[PDB]
Amino acid sequence: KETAAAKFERQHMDSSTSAASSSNYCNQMMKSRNLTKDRCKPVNTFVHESLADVQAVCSQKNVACKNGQTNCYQSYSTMSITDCRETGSSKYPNCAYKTTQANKHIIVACEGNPYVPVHFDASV
């Protein structure tokens, strides 16, 4: 299984593109990253950075995760994120998304050795 840090990578990292170049970027992109291989995942976010850049968020500002958990961290600078939200009924295998390209600060849930983003939580 694609656990914690690898699952973050799978779900989020899109470094090859600096931004959602299309209003339908998420539709295709979601597929290639294994996210929609069985079911069309209702909501997800891509993050247009390297892993190294996002590891850098884990030691900026400590925050609470959306549930209340103490192990989420925010960057002092805005990051290029692409929110992928299902539109017009996301059916398998023709998964249908609405794409948002935004430059917002990110909350990554971090741990491990070396200390790495394991889960993405919120863009603020």
Q: Is 85 annotated as a binding residue?
A: yes
* DSSP-based three-state secondary structure for 106: strand
Please tell me the distance from the alpha carbon of residue 24 to that of residue 20, in angstroms, as a whole number.
8
Nearest Cα to 65, choosing from 17, 20, 18, 111? 111
φ, ψ at 86 (rounded to 5°): -65, 130
User: Can 12 be counted among the known catalytic residues?
Assistant: yes
Q: Is 43 annotated as a binding residue?
A: yes
Q: Is 66 annotated as a binding residue?
A: yes
Q: Is 41 annotated as a binding residue?
A: yes
User: Can 119 be counted among the known catalytic residues?
Assistant: yes
Please tell me the distance from the alpha carbon of residue 105 to that of residue 31, in angstroms, as a whole number.
25
Q: Is 7 annotated as a binding residue?
A: yes
The gap from C-alpha 117 to its chain's centroid, in whole angstroms, comes to: 10
Residue whose structure tokens are 């299902």: 86
Catalytic residue among 5, 12, 79, 118, which? 12
Catalytic residue among 47, 106, 119, 120, which? 119
| Enzyme catalytic residues | 12, 119
- Binding-site positions for substrate: 7, 10, 41-45, 66, 85
- Binding-site positions: 7, 10, 41-45, 66, 85
